């Protein structure tokens, strides 16, 4: 099918190899630290001690055999940039790299990393949103303006109805799901009961939702 | 009202930086001087302090904060001691970064209010996108049901939504279409889907992957 | 023209020291305090600064400089970041020292204007002089044609310019003779060549070595 | 076959051992760092891990077999001085050493190094010349006063003739070569066309050339 190589068994890298392997893919786990390789031995199709900045060592892995190579070295900029440069030079189709900061992202961009990820910064802003707005449990941005948000229902909604407390007429948003005591009602039909601490999944404009949050909850 | 970010990591530093951009009251704490100096501009306040020493934590007036975030994820000893102090000092909400399953366990037992694994979580999400080249982004509603954002293949170019019904056929529902940046929230059949458009589907996790196989 | 030398190495420090002796405007930058103090006297100006931090580079007023030289050749991370900053800050001429082929490649891609390998270059030149004990110094005009300075053997002692011709015999041309320090430029046949006198020949690289074999 | 020994596989040393070997000489690559030796294994007649300051280790290499020994240790003064002292004591005919600074040069001079080189300082002044004078591409000094200089032709010379814009009479210098679009004209005969960005090779007095640079270009 398709073959994966995870260079850098960080908390990020190690989670990718561990997941991809649980999904039952072909994953090569690479790390310069022996102890890290030994640890992920059981959680990878394969584990190998190698310094990803040395070319001959990368060829020994048969890196050219991989469709996707992930460089999850995010603390060492020098290790990361050199490795990704090697990978691009060795004509790897998809190179996904972890970046440290804006500048590291810039170097990776210029040496042709195919997709760059800031796992910490991204999770940072998402957690910050949940801190600031105690109502938002989780969310996904469709664009800069429009977003799907999962909200914890306050007592301000306990035993309330949809045909009653409408959103798309009143706020221009649409409710997609309700989760009461673990049970899930997708594409719910008005009227439905919403209890307190229910997961309410709303969808629309980012500003529109926060207006509903203010006045509805 | 008031936020305290202890540990200006890449994770911690992003929280302070964001909360401050949102215009909240954020206290940036770090034992490393250079880190404090860096986040000075991106915080309501910056202070050099060793969060494991009690008197130093009191000097910050930590008891003044509604939410304290311990984004120390490499040092288990630093993290556990700090969080223990915070719980002992009766902070209402303590959010901590964990390193691994075991560190999570120690934090759980000393009463951290919410524990986060930013790397492991982002790990599984990125792995999903690696394995399934179609899934751009997603959010899990539960273990079984999920909302998924999909990149449309040539297998969908100039297809009508009602023509290629996801609902009747697969038990899923299409929520949005993004063509050339323009967004059609809650789209009405029929609508044109071009190649490389963002298709937002919703339903059962297994059901979606069945649509991915046969539809795309 | 205003010059900025970031990295007071043996290489960087020599550029600063020379440009300053020539009486230009040179800003000497280094993260190591002791290095800055040392080159204080040998620069228009010396400043302790970490060239990878942007605000620190702006504090120098780096955007003031026509030519900035990054003579950091041991630290690849320092070098690449600095040069990236310099390109981002729209510096017209960025001259960087490289460590190896790969470092050269990263610098190339982030838009360094001229890349130099002072050690590798001087390596091959010294190697030539080792292998061929006759060649004192040289300059390549191309890959094939070169001007070479040769130490005259006893095989040439008291030989005449026309007598031992190269303009007809080998297709090369003699440009200068240096006997006991005295210099005869574009010499007219016949001229006396003593032993150990610097002979400056010019032509094809292969042609010269043929003259070296048969003439000397 | 003349025999070469390169002690210290720096960027400088490693370049000598890589070049001499490409020329197909006999070169012994020595370094105390294992990883360095392993790297230059392919690019040397031989590679050996050895501490050049220990005598017995130097004898084990059979150093007395070598006509030319190059000590390209330029960061460690103690390593360099001791090594060179050993080499002189062991009666090596030609000892070429890399120096760090004026003082290191002095120590080497007194312990009988046969030729001392400052690769960085030398390349420093040459590059500085090219920075200051944007016209000079490359040069070679015949003495302190007289020099052969390679110059990039400005628009101030585009489609100009040789005998038209004479140097042999006007400035006391002589043009030796012209390089237009890669093609090379050695000992050019007046008149010849000089286009813009054409490599012009002039020869004469250092002051004389810069006078031509000012008024001609
Ligand atoms: N040259 C290399 N080749 C392969 N792996 C390397 C190399 N250098 C470092 N690593 C490994 O890559 C992994 C990436 O960790 P990195 O410590 O440098 O920090 P990190 O990306 O911030 O970690 P985390 O994912 O937990 O946030 C480590 O296990 C490290 O040993
Ligand atoms: N005793 C302490 N008190 C307060 N802050 C500390 C203390 N010890 C360490 N820190 C800081 O807290 C932060 C925690 O970072 P830690 O490097 O050690 O890894 P990390 O949290 O996983 O990094 P990252 O967030 O980038 O993934 C760092 O800025 C560190 O300097
Ligand atoms: N971020 C920085 N900002 C300014 N100067 C720096 C920075 N980082 C390193 N330097 C300085 O630049 C130089 C780094 O180059 P490196 O000395 O280690 O030597 P080199 O370029 O490989 O060769 P050489 O010493 O012969 O010039 C050092 O002098 C160091 O003090
Ligand atoms: N005592 C020794 N015995 C054997 N090898 C040594 C000894 N000392 C240094 N070396 C090696 O010789 C080399 C000399 O490099 P040196 O770092 O010390 O600085 P350098 O001459 O400025 O480097 P560069 O050639 O890049 O300019 C290194 O590879 C080093 O490992």
Q: Which among C117, C147, C162 is the end of a domain?
A: C117
Place of tokens 């190094």: D113
Residue of A nearest to B199 (CA): A142
Alpha carbon nearest to ligand 3 atom 25, residue: C9
- Domain with B71, as residue range(s), is 1-117
Is there a domain that residue A123 lies in? no
Cβ of residue B11 lying under 6 Å from some atom of ligand 2: yes
User: What are the chain C neighbours of D44 within 8 Å (beta carbons)?
Assistant: none
Q: Pick the last residue of a domain from D85, D118, D151.
A: D118
Cα–Cα distance, C104 to C102 (Å, whole number): 5
Q: CATH number, domain at B190?
A: 3.30.70.1450
Residues A77 and A140 in one domain: no
**C-beta of A113 in contact with ligand 1 (< 6 A):** no
Torsion angle (degrees, nearest 10) of CA C83, C84, C86, C91: 100
Residues whose CB is less than 8 angstroms from the CB of residue A200 and which lie 6 or more positions away in sequence, other chains included: A150, A151, A152, A153, A157, A175, A177, A178, A194
SS3 annotation, chain C: CEEEEECCCCCHHHHHHHHHHCCCEEEEEECCHHHHHHHCCCCCEEEECCCCCHHHHHHCCHHHCCEEEECCCCCHHHHHHHHHHHHHCCCCEEEEECCCHHHHHHHHHCCCCEEECHHHHHHHHHHHHHHCCCEEEEEECCCCEEEEEEECCHHHCCEECCCCCCCCCCCCEEEEEEECCEEEECCCCCCEECCCCEEEEEEEHHHHHHHHHHHC
Residue C78 CB–ligand 3 contact under 6 Å:
yes
Residue D20 lies in a domain: yes
Q: How many angstroms separate the CA atoms of C64 and C45, rounded?
A: 14
- For residue A124, tell me if it sits in a domain: no
Work out the burial of residue C4: count CB atoms within 10 Å of its CB; fewer than 13 is exposed, 13-18 middle, 19 or more buried.
buried
Q: Tell which atom from ligand 4 comes closest to the C-alpha of D31.
A: 5
Ligand nearest the Cα of residue A58 is: 1
For residues A51 and A137, state if they share a domain: no
Q: How far is C152 from chain D (nearest CA, A)?
A: 15
Q: Is A73 inside any structural domain?
A: yes
For residues A113 and A215, membership in a common domain is answered with no
Cβ of residue B160 lying under 6 Å from some atom of ligand 2: no
Residue B125 included in any domain: no
Kindly state whether residue D28 falls inside one of the protein's structural domains.
Answer: yes
Site to probe by mutation for ligand 1, drawn from A75, A119, A123 as the one with most ligand atoms within 8 Å of Cβ, is A75
Query: Which among A25, A182, A203 has the least Cβ separation from residue B131?
Result: A25
Q: Which of C129, C196, C130, C208 is nearest to C171 (CA)?
A: C208
C 10-29 residues with CB < 8 A to D: 10-15, 17-19, 22, 24
Residue in B13, B54, B70, B78 to alter for ligand 2 test, most ligand atoms within 8 A of Cβ? B78
Close Cβ partners of A118 (under 8 Å, ≥ 6 residues apart) = A98, A99, A105, B10
Contacting partners of chain B (3+ CB pairs under 8 A): A
C50 annotated among ligand-binding-site residues? yes
Check whether B15 is labelled as a binding-site residue: no
* D169 labeled part of a ligand binding site: no
**Shortest-distance ligand to the CA of residue A35:** 1
Contact B10 A74 (CB under 8 A): yes
**Contact by Cβ (8 Å): A23, A43:** no
Pairing of strands C173-179, A146-152: unpaired
To the nearest whole Å, the CA of B125 is away from the closest chain A CA by 8
Which residues make Cβ contacts (< 8 Å) with residue C132, sequence separation at least 6? C209, C212
- Residue numbers in D near C100 (CB within 8 A): 11
Cα–Cα distance for residue pair B157/B179, rounded to 1 Å: 11
Return the partners of chain C (3 or more C-beta pairs < 8 Å): A, D
Q: What is the resolution of this structure in A?
A: 3.5
Mutate to test the interface with B, among A22, A80, A123 (most CBs of B within 10 A): A123
**Cα–Cα distance, C34 to C5 (Å, whole number):** 16
* Cβ contact D8:D31 at 8 Å: yes
**Domain CATH code at residue D88:** 3.40.50.720
Domain match, C89 and C136 both:
no
Which pair of tokens denotes residue A177?
């799901």
* Three-class SS of C129-154: HHHCCCEEEEEECCCCEEEEEEECCH
Contact across the interface for A103 and C109, Cβ inside 8 Å: no
- Tell whether A7 lies on the interface with C, counting CB pairs under 8 A: no
Experimentally determined by? X-ray
Residues D45 and D17 sit within 8 Å (Cβ to Cβ): no
d(CA D122, CA C7): 17
Which residue from D20, D124, D148 is facing C14, i.e. has the nearest CB? D124
CA–CA gap between residue B6 and residue A123 (Å, rounded)? 17
- Residue B174 is assigned to a ligand binding site: no
Ligand nearest to the CA of B80: 2
Residues in chain B within 8 Å Cβ distance of A182: 142
Considering the domain architecture, whether residues D87 and D142 belong to the same structural domain is answered as no
- List all residues of chain A from 84 to 103 with a beta carbon under 8 Å from chain C: 85-86, 89, 103
Query: Is the separation of the CB atoms in D16 and D44 below 8 Å?
Result: no
Q: Which of B6, B18, B178 to mutate to test the interface with A (most CBs of A within 10 A)?
A: B18
Task: Judge if B76 and B168 occupy the same domain.
Answer: no
**Coil, strand or helix at D77:** helix
| Chain C residues lying within 8 Å of D141, measured CB to CB | 137
D123 falls within a domain? no
Contact C77 A77 (CB under 8 A): yes
Out of C84, C109, C111, whose CB is closest to A103? C84
Q: Residue length, chain B?
A: 216
Is residue A144 one of the residues assigned to a domain? Answer: yes
Dihedral-angle region of residue B125 (phi above 0 means left; psi in -120 to 50 means alpha; beta otherwise): alpha
- The residues near D183 (Cβ < 8 Å, ≥ 6 apart) are none
Residue B95 and residue B139 in one domain: no
* Consecutive H or E run containing B25: strand B25-30
DSSP structure string for A74-116: -S-HHHHHHHHHHHHHTT-SEEEEE-SSHHHHHHHHHTT-SEE
Q: How far apart are CA B63 and CA B46, in angstroms?
A: 17
In this structure, the answer to whether residues A167 and A100 fall within a common structural domain is no
CA of C119 to the centre of ligand 3 (A): 15
Q: How many domains does chain B have?
A: 2
Q: What are the two backbone dihedrals, phi and then psi, of residue A135, each rounded to the nearest 5 degrees?
A: -80, -35
C139 contacts D148? CB cut-off 8 A: yes
Q: CA-CA distance, B36 to B52, in Å (whole number)? A: 17
Is A33 annotated for ligand binding? Answer: yes
Is residue C92 located within the same domain as residue C9? yes
- CA C53 to CA C82: how far, in whole Å? 8
Give the burial class of D213: count Cβ atoms within 10 A of its Cβ; 0-12 exposed, 13-18 middle, 19 or more buried: middle
Ligand-binding site membership of D11 (annotated): yes
Q: Under an 8 A CB cutoff, do A148 and B147 touch?
A: yes
Cα–Cα distance, B206 to C2 (Å, whole number):
66
C43 labeled binding residue: no
Nearest ligand 2 atom to the CA of B71 is: 21
How distant is the Cα of B129 from the closest Cα of chain A, in angstroms? 10
Q: Does residue D112 share a domain with residue D186?
A: no
CA-nearest residue, atom 20 of ligand 3: C73
Give the ligand 2 atom nearest the CA of B75: 18
Query: Which residues of chain B make contact with A200, given a CB cutoff of 8 A?
Result: none
- What is the DSSP annotation of D85-114? HHHHHTT-SEEEEE-SSHHHHHHHHHTT-S
Contact status, residue D103 vs residue C103, Cβ threshold 8 Å: no
Q: Are residues D98 and D151 in the same domain?
A: no
Q: ∠C159-C165-C153 over CA atoms, to 5°?
A: 40
CA dist., res. A114 & res. C106, Å (int): 16
CA C70 from centre of chain: 16
Could you count the other beta carbons within 10 Å of the beta carbon of residue D164? 10
Q: Which residues 38-57 on chain C approach chain D with CB closer than 8 angstroms?
A: none
CB A100 near ligand 1, within 6 Å: no
Choosing among C28, C94, C101, C118, which should be mutated to test the D contact, i.e. which has the most D CBs within 10 A? C118
Ligand 4 centre to CA of A215 (Å) is: 72
Q: Is C52:C85 a contact under the CB 8 Å cutoff? A: yes
CB contact under 8 A, B130 and A11: no
Nearest CA to ligand 1 atom 11: A8
CA distance B58 to chain A (A): 23
Q: Do C103 and C136 lie in a common domain?
A: no
Contacting C residues, span 180-199, partner chain D, CB-CB under 8 Å:
181, 183, 185-186, 198
**Which among D3, D4, D5, D19 is the top mutation candidate for probing chain C, defined by the most C β-carbons within 10 Å of its own β-carbon?**
D19
């Amino acid at each position: 099918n398709k073959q994966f190589a995870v260079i850098g068994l960080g908390r990020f890298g190690g989670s990718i190899v561990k997941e991809l392997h649980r999904m039952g893919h072909e994953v090569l786990a690479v790390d310069i630290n022996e102890e890290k390789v030994n640890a992920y031995a059981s959680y990878a199709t394969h584990a190998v001690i190698a310094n990803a900045t040395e070319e001959n060592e990368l060829l020994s892995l048969g890196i050219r055999n991989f469709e996707y190579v992930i460089v999850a070295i995010g603390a060492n900029i020098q290790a990361s940039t050199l490795t990704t440069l090697l990978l691009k030079e060795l004509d790897i189709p998809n190179i996904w790299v972890k970046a440290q900061n804006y500048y590291h992202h810039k170097v990776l961009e210029k040496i042709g990393a195919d997709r760059i990820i800031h796992p910490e910064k991204d999770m940072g802003v998402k957690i910050a949103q949940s801190l600031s707005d105690e109502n938002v449990l989780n969310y996904i941005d469709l664009s800069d303006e429009y977003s799907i948000v999962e909200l914890l229902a306050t007592r301000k909604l306990d035993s309330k109805s949809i045909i009653d407390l409408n959103v798309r007429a009143k706020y221009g948003c649409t409710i997609l799901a309700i989760k009461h005591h673990g049970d899930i009602c997708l594409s719910p039909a008005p009227e439905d009961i919403i209890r307190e601490q229910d997961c309410l999944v709303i969808m629309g404009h980012k500003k529109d939702i926060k207006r509903f949050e203010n006045e509805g909850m």
